[PDB]
From a paper:
The large-conductance calcium- and voltage-activated K+ channel (BK) plays a fundamental role in establishing negative feedback loops to control the firing patterns of neurons, transmitter release, insulin secretion, and smooth muscle contraction. BK channels comprise four identical α subunits (Slo1)2,3 with seven transmembrane segments (TMD) and a large C-terminal cytosolic domain (CTD). A voltage sensing domain (VSD, segments S0–S4) and a pore-gate domain (segments S5–S6) reside in the membrane. Additionally, two homologous regulators of the conductance of K+ domains (RCK) in each subunit (RCK1 and RCK2) assemble as a tetrameric gating ring (4× CTD) and serve as the cytoplasmic Ca2+ sensor.
Alanine substitution at hF315 (aF304) generates stable closed channels, even at saturating Ca2+ concentrations. To test the idea that hydrophobic interactions affect coupling, we solved the structure of the mutant F304A in a Ca2+-bound condition. We found that in the presence of Ca2+, the voltage sensor of F304A populates the resting configuration without the electrostatic constraint imposed by the R3Q mutation. The gating ring exhibits an expansion of approximately 49 Å, slightly narrower than the expansion observed for R1Q-apo and R3Q Ca2+-bound (52 Å). In Ca2+-bound F304A, rather than tilting around M298-I299 the S6 helix moves upward near I308 while I301 remains exposed towards the inner cavity, as in R3Q-apo. In the F304A Ca2+-bound structure, I308 interacts with I301 from the neighboring monomer, but this interaction does not lead to the tilting of S6. Finally, overlaying the adjacent α-monomers of open R1Q-apo with F304A Ca2+-bound resulted in clashes between residues of the inner cavity, suggesting that the S6 helix of F304A Ca2+-bound has a structure like that of the closed R3Q-apo.
Residue numbers in the entry:
A (entry chain A): 14 to 44, 79 to 426
B (entry chain B): 214 to 561, 567 to 621
The structure:
Amino acid sequence: RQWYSFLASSLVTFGSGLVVIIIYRIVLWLCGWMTEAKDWAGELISGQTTTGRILVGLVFLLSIASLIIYFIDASTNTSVETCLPWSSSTTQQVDLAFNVFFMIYFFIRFVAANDKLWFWVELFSFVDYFTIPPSFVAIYLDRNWLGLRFLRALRLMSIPDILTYLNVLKTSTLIRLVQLVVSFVSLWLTAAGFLHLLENSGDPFFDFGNAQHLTYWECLYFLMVTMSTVGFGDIFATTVLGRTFVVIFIMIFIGLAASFIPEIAEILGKRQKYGGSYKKERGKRHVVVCGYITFDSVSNFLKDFLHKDREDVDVEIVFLHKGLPGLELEGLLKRHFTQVEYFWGSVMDANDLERVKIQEADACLVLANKYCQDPDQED
Amino acid sequence: NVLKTSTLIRLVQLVVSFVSLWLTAAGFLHLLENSGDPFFDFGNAQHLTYWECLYFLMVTMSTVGFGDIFATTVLGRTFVVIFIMIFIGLAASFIPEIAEILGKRQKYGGSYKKERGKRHVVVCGYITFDSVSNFLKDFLHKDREDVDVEIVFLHKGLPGLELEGLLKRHFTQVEYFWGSVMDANDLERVKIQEADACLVLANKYCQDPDQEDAANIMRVISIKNYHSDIKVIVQLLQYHNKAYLLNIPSWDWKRGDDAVCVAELKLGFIAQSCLAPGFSTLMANLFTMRSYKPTPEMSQWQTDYMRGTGMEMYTEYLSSAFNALTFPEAAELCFSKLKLLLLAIEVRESTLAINPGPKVKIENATQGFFIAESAEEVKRAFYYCKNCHANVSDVRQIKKCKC
Ligand SMILES: [Ca+2]
């Protein structure tokens, strides 16, 4: 019966503030509470100042704390709605303590985003519009509803902002990945919450009689087997709204087959295989070999350098080259791995010269591409 | 003729030819299952809704195939087998190609909004993470005066991830817009008439310096063509091209326009170093903002050098206490009491005098040129109230006196 009281509280919050913004714009169009506040809120929400930095990291951490309470709510009980006396459960109190802090942070933003129609419609404002009012209805009404509280899982997309404002993610590929991962974990968790709501509520067209009691975890599973286009149908949608949402969701997540899983596999595969350093034993000598390194040049070199007719000296050979070895060269290096090493790098870089311990090296050999396009450039 | 753009007609053609065919096939499958098969006197039949057929066709087009709904007439089935062979073929174009077209939009469209109190400068030409970071690091440096100028980038390309990160870190006083100073609409987007100055940066590592100069001369032409009175500061990679600019009918050196020529300056500095070895490293350090940062793990000579690199050139009005001093005793007074080195003065028409002799005396509101660790240091030469207040040796004490 009573559920619409929660959702209506969200809608009147959105609508009343929107109408206030419109009549304010219209009154101006007929016709420190100054730009200092806009700038002050700006830096805060941007981590210029240390206090801004603390506040923004703490908004991010409390967003996770509220999301975890939604997982505890979705894991426990059975129904999407129950008439719990408001004071009784500790989890419901401490979620309200996070909820008021998000409401405070909102206004702050409002100030930085300068009391504007476009701001009042930005995604994270809706996340709040739909979370803050229902938790306040739950103070007045001795009842609990899971009621779109999953939307907090969108605020987890602050991670790339937090890690770039605090500036720990240095590399372009690392920011990209983390942006891909977090924008995939959000949306996946978010859609599982929305499907869980639609199936467990049942359809309004059928007086909520047509309903299906999924857990949130079964919705996560169901969305992964449909995102991957496997589709076992052991779990499947049965409300008409649910179904719909699945039809819409498929059209979105076939579109998100551009980037995501293939592009993260690309970036995560582009790492450097032959990083790291040589370790010099006291007894062994070594020589560093660089310049033109290839399977034919290395095999012609090794075949003479380690030949059986040569004296029984125990020199290790350390290759240093600015590229990944080919399969046949990795095979050759594997066959000689007892006295041969290869490292990615260049003798043009003093860090790579330290990696190969060039000071302790007995000699350094520079090989040439005898079949180059211009002998003078190779020299 | 409402759909102007080639990409818009293409998309709308893709969308509508996907909504048709999908709706159409749902109707045909709905007919075949709900009629039943004619081979079996219509006894073999399955009562789907049209909406269940739409759903069933979407989960088979996407190749998900739950099989919660599935075809059971032999005609239905057939039609599903044919339909799969069609809609695997329509995986060429459709969903990936509409996602491409819908993704090709412009991220950094739109316009700057000018507040009355704030100044801004427009920056264009060679814009990249390294050039922008080298520019921002000096332009917003802590040792610089507490001016509140906003920086508006205008460039004909999408910023790289590291540049979007840099722009995000400075978003309180930095903006970026897609466009070119060759287009009068983009000059309006950035409100160039209200801009305090425009800076044109150069690709110093280009394939041909003369083509990079030709491109920058155009820009300067295009900016001045839009509004004459904009102060334009332009980077040139060859002196032989500077002339061209001098002819543009509105380059007015007296107004502020300037052309930093990296050739003229480079070779110049090096020349001075022939007459006084080392100078070029004196001056180059003097014209870049840098705070001193002592550390462990650094030699005595490096700490002395580093302290020196901390100093930069600044300019400030001399206080009333300097009135009628000769320049040499004013400079002595700055070094001894203020802990500032005074090189030169603006002499009132306007001219600049370097180390002028005893013949020259400080007039009221004379602007001096100083070497100091920061703008906060040089303000002592403005607040200094003579023997009325300033008689205590911790220079830090100097602050704005009562009269
Ligand atoms: Ca300094």
